[PDB]
Amino acid sequence: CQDVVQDVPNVDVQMLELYDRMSFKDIDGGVWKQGWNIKYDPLKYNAHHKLKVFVVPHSHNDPGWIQTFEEYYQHDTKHILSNALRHLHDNPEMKFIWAEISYFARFYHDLGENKKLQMKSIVKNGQLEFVTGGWVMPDEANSHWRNVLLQLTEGQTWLKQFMNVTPTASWAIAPFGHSPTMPYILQKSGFKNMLIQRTHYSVKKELAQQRQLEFLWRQIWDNKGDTALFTHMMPFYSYDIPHTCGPDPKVCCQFDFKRMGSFGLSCPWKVPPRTISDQNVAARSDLLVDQWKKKAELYRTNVLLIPLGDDFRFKQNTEWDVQRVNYERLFEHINSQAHFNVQAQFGTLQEYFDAVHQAERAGQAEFPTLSGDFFTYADRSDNYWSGYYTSRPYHKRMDRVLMHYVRAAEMLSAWHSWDGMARIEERLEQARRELSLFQHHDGITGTAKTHVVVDYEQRMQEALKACQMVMQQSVYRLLTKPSIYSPDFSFSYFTLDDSRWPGSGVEDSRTTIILGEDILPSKHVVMHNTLPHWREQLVDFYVSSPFVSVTDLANNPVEAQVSPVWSWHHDTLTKTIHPQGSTTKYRIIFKARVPPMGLATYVLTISDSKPEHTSYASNLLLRKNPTSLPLGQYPEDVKFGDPREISLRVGNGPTLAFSEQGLLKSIQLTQDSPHVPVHFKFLKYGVRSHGDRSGAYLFLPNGPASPVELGQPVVLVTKGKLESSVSVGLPSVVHQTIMRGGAPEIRNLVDIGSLDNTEIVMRLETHIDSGDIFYTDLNGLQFIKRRRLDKLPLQANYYPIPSGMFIEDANTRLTLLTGQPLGGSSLASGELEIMQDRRLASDDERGLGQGVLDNKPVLHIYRLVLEKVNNCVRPSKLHPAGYLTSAAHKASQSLLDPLDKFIFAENEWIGAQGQFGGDHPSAREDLDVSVMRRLTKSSAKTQRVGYVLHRTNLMQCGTPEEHTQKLDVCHLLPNVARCERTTLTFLQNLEHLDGMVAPEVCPMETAAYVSSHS
């Protein structure tokens, strides 16, 4: 395996280094506003060296943005595709590329067989070419890599089945900045080329000056270069026609033949297009070829890419005609006039790349190597697109919940073959497709209109229900004696219990386990562990009595803690935010121990009085002017006091100290170690009263954040043997620190209410000497080094925090792991901050046509890990990556893939079993089975199961780290007949594996395997 820690890759362009050197001056470059006046040597091209130009027609179709997916399909996309089919069929030299398979699948399935065949023919003959072939064109900032892969697989699996093609070139013209997670996944999914567009204007200028817009993009840790993927970055401000023919949009706009008037479009630069005729073609061609030759100066080969399209283009027949006929006249003239030395034609993206690489192999070009990312994007001036790292955070959190439920549903149901009547494949496809749709660059990004966000939410809610149905049917089958198992595929044998979604204070959604002498003495519950190692985790359930004890299915008592159910209320009468306790519902908490990729059953039983193995938390309400807080049968009376500093310790874990406002002030790791200052604070950013306003996309703060005025908040302290917590009702946030014996969990119930033009940030202040360095993750896959740059404005120093961030010095590191993607930064040495929500009254001029005023309460979850790192083997100071410790990685897994909890619905479970998966291998902690998916329906003689295995890289810090078993996924199911390594989408077999044994992957590698079973 490659060493991903100790060898700093030698690349031509390393983006962090480039950022350190660049001046980012925003000067008027002339007609190319953010570039310079491009000059070329007319004698560069001649009879023996011509400029090859590929004009590539396209239509950018958003699966939801200002209309819903279905609205756009009905109004626009179905017409675009129907007219594409017609106009391509009738014009054999015309070409068209298509990206969004969600739309294409919708269209194709509605076609009559005659048209289906015509469509297959124009694909087979290369007129219509699929680019990327994902369900969507995903966001790259907020998306988890698992969901990027999911949506890619959904689209490509559809394309293989119905169109018999698998794209090897990717087209990403629209996401707001670009992540190296994309080439990572694409290169492991058969791709050979990719195209990107939305990079900072200063980066485009810098790379253009060096002809480094085409590069071999490798991962930041990759010393050898095996991850490299050829990447083309477009040079100009937009992907529209005015910014794709050449540097001067006043000229290029004249070659968008949709802008002459009858289509309701015009040219902002005030020179309209004119129909190409015999009397103007020479003059028109002269202007156009001049633009092309200028664009060609920015690249290294004699092959030029000219995209020809815009949003929802090629909709009307008249539009197809006007673009095609005018370009055909230009091509006929240009190609016939030797003095131009140009050969121009309609082409596809693959044709462009094939020609570039032909030129490369002819020796006319060498391409530079590059590592790094392309965040944070700015399209002009100080307009940095860091707002969408946080916008619509409820749905950002929902994404992560559904991510896990899809994984769990696919894994749980993969163990068996299911009859068609069970509707398992149907529900899983629904769930995969809704989650995939939300990866769209207007979905998870929070940049869609309110009614579109509602549509995405409804879709995801349906997906969650689908997942629950599949999971609970699977649990019942896996844990019932086979000769007793008698499924009703419509019945709910179990109800999922999720303690953190939608969450306490967000939705009263969870079922109370109702026990009683005169109703039901006991209840079975089941935990699922999707991770491939034995796992313990505290789990909680609501119960109707405090006198409940827990046993495993061997009837061994399990230590439990009962706590009250506390609900926070904004008291409109007293004008205070304070907790109310239930007098009929209680929380029972215990440690579940669950096999790798397995299930464990426990029983909750009521008694008349305090059970031997159940303890009761104490509760202390700190406030002036307290009132009583009765708790029914709960055996310990609530205590009251004036606000005061408090300290808590659970188990042998850290000791945490809190301010009188209920906010963390210090962490002490061991009994005789220092009390390390770690201070939580909440602050607010505002919006500018003059100039550009923040909106869904842009973060344009009116200076550094100002502290939230806290008043004298009510603090609730719960102290238990298994779990303790401090909760405080702050303005807009119920902030909770929970301790279970390791790194604390933080939960914020964020309700920004009617606070217009406000962004609420949570900041951590420490004494870590981090300087200007911090680390943030990319797509939950890798951690990249960031450097705060005071030469850039505040909003430029904000980065996506899709799963975590950290700061460190020689001795100490603080890592904050997240259960949802949000924006964040380190704006001063020793600080971390992460945005919670934003409510913005104005539009930010990027097309949305609304602010963000549809906020709703959201429960954000985190883990906070303070560690000594003086003994850790870390990368050198020049390495662009960072890596988590074991503790931080496990903390991230606790947030993203917690145990699933199932409550048996009926009174008695006949044939119940205690465990599933006790014989599954318990793999090394850095390995995950990211995907387990049965690939075949029940009628297939040879069953196939696909696995995606990911190995992260964890820091070596002197812990022996012992006793784990080799995980061979190909032997997880019996009767293996073949094991194959495949692309990550499962669509191509790459290796036939000796002995049917799937080897474990290297650090930072992801591999896919398919086992076949007789």
Ligand SMILES: *[C@@H]1O[C@H](CO)[C@@H](O)[C@H](O)[C@H]1NC(C)=O
């Ligand atoms: C699918 O495409 C391959 C070439 O990539 C071709 O050989 C094969 O016949 C096609 N399969 C069918 C029948 O669709």
Ligand SMILES: OC[C@H]1O[C@H](O)[C@@H](O)[C@@H](O)[C@@H]1O
């Ligand atoms: O300005 C951002 C905006 O650009 C275009 O209009 C669309 O493709 C949207 O997907 C995107 O949100």
Ligand SMILES: [Zn+2]
């Ligand atoms: Zn778009």
